Design a binder for this molecule. Structure first.
Ligand SMILES: [K+]
Ligand SMILES: [Mg+2]
Ligand SMILES: [Mg+2]
Ligand SMILES: [Mg+2]
Ligand SMILES: [Mg+2]
Ligand SMILES: [Mg+2]
Ligand SMILES: [Mg+2]
Ligand SMILES: [Mg+2]
Ligand SMILES: [Mg+2]
Ligand SMILES: [Mg+2]
Ligand SMILES: [Mg+2]
Ligand SMILES: [Mg+2]
Ligand SMILES: [Mg+2]
Ligand SMILES: [Mg+2]
Ligand SMILES: [Mg+2]
Ligand SMILES: [Mg+2]
Ligand SMILES: [Mg+2]
Ligand SMILES: [Mg+2]
Ligand SMILES: [Mg+2]
Ligand SMILES: [Mg+2]
Ligand SMILES: [Mg+2]
Ligand SMILES: [Mg+2]
Lengths: 119, 88, 101, 73
RNA sequence: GUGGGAGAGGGUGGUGGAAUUCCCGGAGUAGCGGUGAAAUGCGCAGAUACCGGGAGGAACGCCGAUGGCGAAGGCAGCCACCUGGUCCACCCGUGACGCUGAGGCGCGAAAGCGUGGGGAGCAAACCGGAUUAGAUACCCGGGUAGUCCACGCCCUAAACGAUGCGCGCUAGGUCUCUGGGUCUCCUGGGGGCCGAAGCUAACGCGUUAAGCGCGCCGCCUGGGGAGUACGGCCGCAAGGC
């Protein structure tokens, strides 16, 4: 019970996992998948294959709500965000745009030691 | 700050003759003007140290020009000191 | 006395009595802070490059004035007391510097 | 790349001190809101650092973007 | 003196957007996180990902430089106010008024101390998870002082160019910031690189001397014992000289 048919597809991709959340043109999630959603457990989650499976499973569950075309937004840089893009490229969804929304601060907060040499 | 009209007033006050700008008298005048300004601004802004150094410097220049003047013309140094109330 | 430009941006959704009221009150603020008004450019409703008070547009008033320095900030703060006023930027005037000419 | 065509070549005579003028200014920042490097603007150190300050004024006035999103990708 | 100048020099007040954290609301479901791999952790009292609203602290992306300013420490959103130093042009005024500088006084990163606030992120100590033969560590999840503000102490440092301050003299080339010009180029004033003569144990330095001179101050006299001991001074203490 949705009948959405056009929407937004967000790919949040880190070094440790991927999450595709697919939502409506308002931005409310229709569905979401991820690395752990598909079987994977450990580090194997930040693997572009896993990222494919996730974006794909997402697009599946999405056409179940009867979605056809989508606009991709990409947050994050890390292994196989591009492979998630490629999953959605032809997942059976026509992709209207692709954007890069990866946030960056104007140096508000002090990063953890892992991330130092910056502010 | 200090407007050119003001500064002019003090020069055309303290000149030895019409036309004098840089004589000792005029300088110690101007120096004193500027000093009194700066210590007014340092009454508030007790935290502004970088300007305060500049005032130490100003002060030292003043006292030197005075040391000179008093080595040359003691009566004219009495004059200056009476006018600006300095040294006491 | 010094030369400043007062940048005021208001709400675009105002009706006329409301607009004339605001400009009336900005006039009064200038008068009562001692600022002579040399020039006005009113551009008006124009698209902002990002939302301001979750508003997609903005209403543009420009003044060029000359006022005593000791009072400037007060005047600026006065102009922000109003509800319908979104930004107030007050800058000292400086003659043009034009590259490639 | 980045040495392809330089901004100040195209534009005619213009005030670099004007924060109120969008159309001139918008030229000087990238696809994102980012103010462009010297090689791309081709201005003198002085010019550049003046454009900075007037751009940042324009930004606070709500006229120019602080940042944008990257299309294509 | 007059006329111009550049600048994150300092102080006070105000404002801006990005980002994190938390809270409220909508939608949505089984994981999110994290590593070499994991586990602790958080999550069906609904997280993670996503959209909208609010709160609050802290820091200022691009410009940003090999750049600039400052005596040094050090200084970076934007605006106004207060304010210090400096550079050039004119060659107008004074007429050696100069240099250095033991004591003294003042400034003086960070950590630290006191009283009162503030407290988002980070984070000694600590609490846990791993790894290892052990692991009081490196890695992971937490977290207090603290980092922030006001006032007052403390006075150290690889507080470094490891190069005291001032003036004169001794090839050039090259890049650059900022003035003035008869604007190719010349000429002041800063920042760099290469190198004449010279210096240097060498490395190197070389009109931004570590060259050639003069003035004045600080300091050195084998290593360890030792910045220890005794004494004095300063400090609330820690401790410093
Ligand atoms: K030393
Ligand atoms: Mg993983
Ligand atoms: Mg400054
Ligand atoms: Mg559990
Ligand atoms: Mg349940
Ligand atoms: Mg709070
Ligand atoms: Mg940079
Ligand atoms: Mg330093
Ligand atoms: Mg100044
Ligand atoms: Mg003369
Ligand atoms: Mg004579
Ligand atoms: Mg200290
Ligand atoms: Mg401290
Ligand atoms: Mg404290
Ligand atoms: Mg930790
Ligand atoms: Mg060093
Ligand atoms: Mg050179
Ligand atoms: Mg030079
Ligand atoms: Mg030789
Ligand atoms: Mg050399
Ligand atoms: Mg011995
Ligand atoms: Mg010691």
């Amino acid at each position: 019970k949705r009948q959405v048919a056009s929407g937004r597809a967000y790919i949040h991709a880190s070094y440790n996992n991927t999450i595709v959340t697919i939502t409506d043109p308002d931005g409310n999630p229709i569905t979401w998948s991820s690395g752990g959603v598909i079987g994977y457990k450990g580090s194997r989650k930040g693997t572009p294959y896993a990222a494919q499976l996730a974006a794909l499973d997402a697009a599946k569950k999405a056409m179940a709500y009867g979605m056809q075309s989508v606009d991709v937004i990409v947050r994050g840089t890390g292994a196989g965000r591009e492979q998630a893009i490629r999953a959605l490229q032809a997942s059976g969804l026509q992709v209207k745009s692709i954007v890069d929304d990866t946030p960056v601060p104007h140096n508000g907060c002090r990063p953890k030691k892992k991330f130092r040499k910056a502010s | 700050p200090i407007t050119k009209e003001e500064k002019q007033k003090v020069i055309q006050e303290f000149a030895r003759f019409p036309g004098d700008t840089g004589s000792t008298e005029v300088q110690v005048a101007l120096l004193t003007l500027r000093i009194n300004r700066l210590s007014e601004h340092l009454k508030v802004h007790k935290k502004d140290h970088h300007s305060h150094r500049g005032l130490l410097m100003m002060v030292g220049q003043r006292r030197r020009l005075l040391r000179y003047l008093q080595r040359e013309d003691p009566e004219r140094y009495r004059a200056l000191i009476e006018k600006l109330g300095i040294r006491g | 006395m010094r030369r400043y430009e007062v940048n005021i941006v208001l709400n675009p959704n105002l009706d006329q009595s409301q607009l004339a009221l605001e400009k009336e009150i900005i006039q009064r603020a200038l008068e009562n802070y001692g600022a002579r008004v040399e020039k006005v450019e009113e551009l008006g409703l124009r698209r902002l490059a990002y939302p301001i008070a979750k508003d997609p547009q903005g209403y543009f008033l420009w003044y060029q004035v000359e006022m005593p320095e000791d009072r400037v900030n007060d005047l600026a703060r006065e102009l922000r007391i109003r509800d319908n006023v979104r930004r107030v930027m007050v800058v000292k005037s400086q003659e043009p510097f034009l590259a490639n000419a | 790349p980045s040495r392809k065509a330089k901004v100040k070549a195209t534009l005619g005579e213009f005030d670099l001190r004007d924060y109120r003028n969008v159309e001139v200014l918008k030229r000087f920042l990238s696809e994102t809101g980012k103010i462009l490097p010297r090689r791309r603007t081709g201005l003198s150190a002085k010019e550049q650092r003046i454009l900075a300050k007037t751009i940042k004024r324009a930004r606070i006035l709500g006229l120019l973007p602080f940042t944008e999103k990257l299309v294509r990708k």
